[PDB]
């Protein structure tokens, strides 16, 4: 790895600089190098990892959706044949996206998840595993598409089971997991009723636990509760 010669602390320092500069590809490369040092990640370092790759793959997904829409329009009735270029370029972006997802899933599998014993780290990594299988599912069309969807579901479900046992209902990681698993149900698994039920039950159980929280924890939890509410409003 090109980061093998850099100190772990220097990689973390530069990941933070890259975030300040909005250089998310650099940020992800630095955090990949930090993970490959083999030591477990702190809470803050897990956030740096997640932010970096979320921004990289988010840009790729946005581009893929633009190109897929152009491609679909080109194959509708009355469109003029434009050649293979749209499909080729959509495939190029799709392959790069899949490459990033495979890289993240590889970091989780070698060996972040197996060494994560605390609820806060294990649920965080399993949520990430569900997320990046979800991104693979968004572009999947072949023989393994159902297996990709089930890999996302399985990771989310293990994370949910741990989070319900080991975390309070206002924990922001538990909330963000439920938010994303709900989106998985709605957008990937064709289960809008499950998506809505999960978002509503998550919101209501967090609401009833807010009274236990400090002002700063309250702000963190209500932020993600509002995202649950936004989705419910979009879906109902």
């Amino acid at each position: 790895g090109a980061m093998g010669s850099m100190e772990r602390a220097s990689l973390i320092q530069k990941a933070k600089l890259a975030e300040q500069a909005e250089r998310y590809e650099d940020m992800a490369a630095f955090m990949k190098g930090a993970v490959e040092k083999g030591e477990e990640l702190s809470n803050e370092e897990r956030c740096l990892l997640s932010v970096a790759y979320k921004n990289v793959v988010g840009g790729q997904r946005a581009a893929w959706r633009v190109l897929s829409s152009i491609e679909q329009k080109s194959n509708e009735e009355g469109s003029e044949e434009k050649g293979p270029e749209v499909r080729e370029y959509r495939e190029k972006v799709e392959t790069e996206l899949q490459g990033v997802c495979d890289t993240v899933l590889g970091l989780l599998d070698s060996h972040l998840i197996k060494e994560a014993g605390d609820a806060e780290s294990r649920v965080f990594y399993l949520k990430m595993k569900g997320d990046y299988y979800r991104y693979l599912a968004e572009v999947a069309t072949g023989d393994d598409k159902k297996r990709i969807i089930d890999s996302a579901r399985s990771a989310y479900q293990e994370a949910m089971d741990i989070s319900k046992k080991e975390m309070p209902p206002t924990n922001p990681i538990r909330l963000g997991l439920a938010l994303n698993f709900s989106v998985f149900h709605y957008e990937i698994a064709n289960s809008p009723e499950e998506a809505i039920s999960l978002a509503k039950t998550t919101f209501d159980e967090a609401m009833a636990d807010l009274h236990t929280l400090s002002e700063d924890s309250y702000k963190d939890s209500t932020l993600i509760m509002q995202l649950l509410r936004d989705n419910l409003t979009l879906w109902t």
């Binding site: 989106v183 957008e187 993600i224 936004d230 879906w235």
Partner: peptide
Amino acid sequence: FPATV
């Protein structure tokens, strides 16, 4: 698109 974090 719906919100995810």
